Amino acid sequence: GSHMALALVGEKIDRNRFTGEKIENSTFFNCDFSGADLSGTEFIGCQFYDRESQKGCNFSRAMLKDAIFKSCDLSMADFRNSSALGIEIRHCRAQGADFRGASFMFCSAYITNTNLSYANFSKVVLEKCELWENRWIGAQVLGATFSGSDLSGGEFSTFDWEAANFTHCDLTNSELGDLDIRGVDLQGVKLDNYQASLLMERLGIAVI
Amino acid sequence: GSHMALALVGEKIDRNRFTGEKIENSTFFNCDFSGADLSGTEFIGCQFYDRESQKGCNFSRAMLKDAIFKSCDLSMADFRNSSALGIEIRHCRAQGADFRGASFCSAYITNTNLSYANFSKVVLEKCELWENRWIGAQVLGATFSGSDLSGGEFSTFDWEAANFTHCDLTNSELGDLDIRGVDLQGVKLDNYQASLLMERLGIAVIG
């Protein structure tokens, strides 16, 4: 089934209300999707963040297997302890979204072209996932692992490279902020020539 | 004056015998030039090494200001404590040559085989030292700071032993240089070299 221009406020969403459904140009303000089965559910052009109340929606413990969020505002969304294997978040605003305890598992996740500023990834396991072209300013990554993921095209100013595992990641074509090859384990990491020159410059070396 | 196709063996060279002269295509086997005045002396195509005795020539404490050696075999030459400001050594073999105590900064040593040469404690700052082979050269306590070493071959070379800050190292085989253990402030490296040094840290440079 498909839904267009819904506008829900303050609702508890029943576990099976939207499973496998397609929802477009809809608003969900202060809604509780916790425990909901959103397997295969596809949200396009939807807003889950309420400018007035400044509340997001609750997705904690939701089943999000193969769910899709395209061009949605998921600012301040609570995804804690969700089951998110194969989730897609594409071209979304996800500022302050909370992923702690979410499972993406072997891992699979596609979070791309997404504003992840101030999002919380503490202790999250996102190994060998698709995580490119995101904005990561102030993202909380304490104890996380992104090992092997493609993070390329990313904006990593105000980002603690020492806080998470980045080994084997693709970091090419990214603003690296304060990354330094003397202080961070970069085994297996991919970087581009422009980034290599910058990083070497930090050591006082001029790459000609 | 100039001189061509001389052959000397086992001679002690008079202090003023060759001062300011040009000497070409000559042989000097086991000859002692120590303390000789060789200011402005030019040697071209000369052999100073005798493979039959495996002995070089002695230039210790020689005055070598503005001297030139081009296309010469200076293997095993003893240059210790010489005065060599502005010396030119170009396209020479200088394997095992000893430069300990030699004073230069201005010097041009280029396109030269310096394998197993001794540069211990030598000061060669801001000099032209490019396209040389440095395999096994001894450099403990030397400083090459600011010199152009580009086009060089540096396998079996102790990068930790001397001062290489501000050097041009571009287009060189770097041997075991590692950015973790060596001060490389001001050093110039090319993109290929940067990629190799990163590779040592496990980092793959792609595009």
From TrEMBL, chain A:
<protein>
    <submittedName>
        <fullName>QnrB1</fullName>
    </submittedName>
</protein>
<dbReference type="Pfam" id="PF00805">
    <property type="entry name" value="Pentapeptide"/>
</dbReference>
<keyword id="KW-0614">Plasmid</keyword>
<dbReference type="InterPro" id="IPR051082">
    <property type="entry name" value="Pentapeptide-BTB/POZ_domain"/>
</dbReference>
<dbReference type="InterPro" id="IPR001646">
    <property type="entry name" value="5peptide_repeat"/>
</dbReference>
From TrEMBL, chain B:
<dbReference type="Pfam" id="PF00805">
    <property type="entry name" value="Pentapeptide"/>
</dbReference>
<dbReference type="InterPro" id="IPR001646">
    <property type="entry name" value="5peptide_repeat"/>
</dbReference>
<protein>
    <submittedName>
        <fullName>QnrB1</fullName>
    </submittedName>
</protein>
<dbReference type="InterPro" id="IPR051082">
    <property type="entry name" value="Pentapeptide-BTB/POZ_domain"/>
</dbReference>
<keyword id="KW-0614">Plasmid</keyword>
